[PDB]
Amino acid sequence: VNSFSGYLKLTDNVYIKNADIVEEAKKVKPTVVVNAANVYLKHGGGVAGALNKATNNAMQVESDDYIATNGPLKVGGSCVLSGHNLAKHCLHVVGPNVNKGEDIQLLKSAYENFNQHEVLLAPLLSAGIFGADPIHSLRVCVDTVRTNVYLAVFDKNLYDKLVSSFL
């Protein structure tokens, strides 16, 4: 048993809810929250900007030190950093950004990072301002992630569309 509430069950291991991932993280304090990161860990907008704002910018301070030491992530890659006040850990995962012209085929590689963690709270990778089709992102998630993933979908109309189209 775990502390996630009100999720619709999609598969053996994938669950979904219409929720603000910031508010969900604050309530659950999961072991792992996933950030929809970029390779520079520049958290100004979207989930990255919302998560970072909820940490009072401590996520961005930590991330700038990580980049100064290690250099940028790869598209499809990830790193584990602090979860600050939201979670034990934050898994920063870089899905391809279609609006920057990155290869959508890297989405599967991005989701494979989730398999290193038994349970995660996560957004859909490469959807929203990332420019990929969220229906596609959900299909890649279910076909790639084998660990238990709790997906938070911010947009109510998109949540309803994802559930009603899910195969």
Instruction: Give contact residues for ligand 2SX (rule: CB under 6 A).
Output: 36, 46-47, 123-124, 127-130, 153-155, 158
Q: How far is the CB of 68 from ligand 2SX (least distance, A)?
A: 25
Torsion of CA 77, 97, 146, 22, to 10 degrees: 100
Q: Which residues pair with 153 in a beta bridge?
A: 18
Nearest approach, Cβ of residue 94 and ligand 2SX (Å): 12
Residue of minimal CB distance from ligand 2SX? 128
Cβ closer to ligand 2SX: 40 or 65?
A: 40
Nearest approach, Cβ of residue 59 and ligand 2SX (Å): 15
Residues in the chain: 167
Q: How far is CA 134 from the centre of its chain?
A: 13
Q: Shortest gap between Cβ of 126 and ligand 2SX (angstroms)? A: 7
Which helix (H) or strand (E) segment holds residue 68: the answer is helix 58-70
CA atoms within 13 A on the CB side of 126: 29
Nearer to ligand 2SX, 87 or 141 (CB): 141
